[PDB]
């Protein structure tokens, strides 16, 4: 049905935008951005540690 | 280097001893439970008959996207390929029918012309008399 | 959810640390007091060797199975794509062998027609005179 | 039923022999590779020490929605991990405020004992 | 990528069907002609025993590789929870003993404030 109609199901376009002084809803959305940014910055650390060695091996 | 079912690059390849062909463990283990035989050669094969035999992918620098953008593309690419592959299978069967009909049409021409030629040649042999 | 001595649902599942098999505390204890051994493998085992009671501590009693479910559905996706491709290429062999043999058989006619034609003028010009 | 590291139902559980605790094979291995120890009892344990020891399949219900479920569940776990860590920092923080008062109080008792000692001398005279 | 017997990059790789390992044909052939065995496990192997189809593959890159990625994510985050569950059980245990020593001591502060003032109330009156 997805291929026939030529329409992909929409994903969560939420984390990217958000807004300060929101409510209890944006309090969650804010706290989401922190944990994923810390996971992000940890996910970039173990890549850079090896760096280009892991890439050129593949 | 690839798997002989999905078209993968296996993480735990396992080879069957009846037909030397390397499959990814999950996919060969699924086939044996579905119907206990080797997928390629259709020979008797079990899970214990298999014999187990590292790959690096560099996770992109911009690696949110894994949940949203990457996963979306994977199920788009799976969806629109198999649909297009179903389109390809349908035309091959239609183009099969046009092949066999045109073939049999030619057979009748040859059969019709085989009676025509030799009798024309025969008439030349008879003409002399 | 079953003991490996009597076959009952174990209300205090203890396990021997020589052969991994979850028994019930009452039955395994009676087997050890009978003879100091593991009932399944007949190896050395004592009462203090057994790990008794439930394990939940600093754990808390979803998510992980969703990924498992995502794998299980993909496993079918691969299996389907294989059987669809087999028939794709296996029909292409029939298509190719036909088209080649069709145009091959087509050249039979071109040859046959010109020879048939030659027989006509030959006999006609001879029968005339 | 539960591995005492993550909280999952283990699909290839393994038990440690230094401390009676059924862990999951993946998680216990990572811990041993970090430091050769048991996570609960901190006893010297290795990978060869482990002895490899219910499966009921989840039938969600009657696919585009399942995409958004997995999104929500990761979105929830991210906050359920976050909330549990700020609470740890503030319970340690409020604990540190108690330690200052504990040691500050036992200095104030020393002056109060002197005032009692001074009083006992005056009463005798 | 390597041959297990020599350690070179094999220019004609042939995989055995008893000990699953990629050997160089010219090397393993001589090993079999010496004695009918697999070099690693010492199980029987002949030359005929030594060895996708129509589905086209693409290289292993960042669906299956994406699913195994999300295991690494969660399995690592599950250990992150232990670091805070275990550390919480030490802080709360030290808090429990700290608040108990506070509750056991403040009864003695209340009595000394009574006794030192009572000694001042007693002595000054005399």
From Swiss-Prot, chain A:
Cell location: Nucleus
Note: Present with 721 molecules/cell in log phase SD medium.
Subunit structure of this chain's protein: Belongs to the NTC complex (or PRP19-associated complex), composed of at least CEF1, CLF1, ISY1, NTC20, SNT309, SYF1, SYF2, and PRP19.
General function of this protein: Involved in pre-mRNA splicing by stabilizing the NTC (or PRP19-associated complex). As a component of the NTC complex, associates to the spliceosome to mediate conformational rearrangement or to stabilize the structure of the spliceosome after U4 snRNA dissociation, which leads to spliceosome maturation.
Protein's UniProt name: Pre-mRNA-splicing factor SNT309
Native species: Saccharomyces cerevisiae (strain ATCC 204508 / S288c)
Lineage of origin: Eukaryota, Fungi, Dikarya, Ascomycota, Saccharomycotina
Curated annotation (Swiss-Prot), chain E:
Segment forming the signal sequence: none
Disulfide bonds: none
Top-rank lineage group of the source organism: Eukaryota
Interaction with CEF1, as annotated region: 63-120
Positions of the UniProt region annotated as Required for self-association: 54-126
Domain U-box stretches: 1-62
Compartments, record wording: Nucleus
Further comment: Present with 11700 molecules/cell in log phase SD medium. The tetramer is an elongated particle consisting of four globular WD40 domains held together by a central stalk.
Subunit structure: Homotetramer. Component of the NTC complex (or PRP19-associated complex), composed of at least CEF1, CLF1, ISY1, NTC20, SNT309, SYF1, SYF2, and PRP19.
Family note: Belongs to the WD repeat PRP19 family.
Main function: Probable ubiquitin-protein ligase involved in pre-mRNA splicing. Acts as a central component of the NTC complex (or PRP19-associated complex) that associates to the spliceosome to mediate conformational rearrangement or to stabilize the structure of the spliceosome after U4 snRNA dissociation, which leads to spliceosome maturation. It is also probably involved in DNA repair.
Protein name per Swiss-Prot or TrEMBL: Pre-mRNA-processing factor 19
Gene name of this polypeptide: PRP19
Part of the full-length chain shown: 1 to 140 of 503
């Amino acid at each position: 049905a997805l291929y026939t109609e030529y329409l992909k199901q929409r994903n969560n376009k939420k984390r990217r935008t958000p807004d300060f002084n929101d409510d209890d809803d944006t309090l969650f959305l804010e706290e989401y951005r922190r944990k994923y940014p810390r996971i992000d910055t940890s996910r970039y650390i173990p890549n850079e540690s090896s760096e280009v060695s892991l890439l050129g091996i593949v | 280097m690839l798997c002989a079912i999905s078209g993968k690059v296996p993480r735990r390849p396992v080879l069957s001893p009846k037909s030397r062909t390397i499959f990814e463990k999950s996919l060969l283990e699924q086939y044996v439970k579905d119907t206990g035989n080797d997928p390629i050669t259709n020979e008797p094969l079990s899970i214990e008959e298999i014999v187990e035999i590292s790959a690096q992918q560099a996770s992109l620098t911009e690696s949110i996207p894994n949940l949203l953008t990457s996963l979306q593309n994977e199920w788009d690419a799976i969806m629109l390929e198999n649909f297009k592959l179903r389109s390809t299978l349908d035309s091959l069967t239609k183009k099969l029918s046009t092949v066999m009909y045109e073939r049999d049409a030619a057979k009748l021409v040859a059969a019709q012309l085989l009676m025509e030629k030799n009798e024309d040649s025969k008439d030349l042999p008879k003409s002399s008399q």
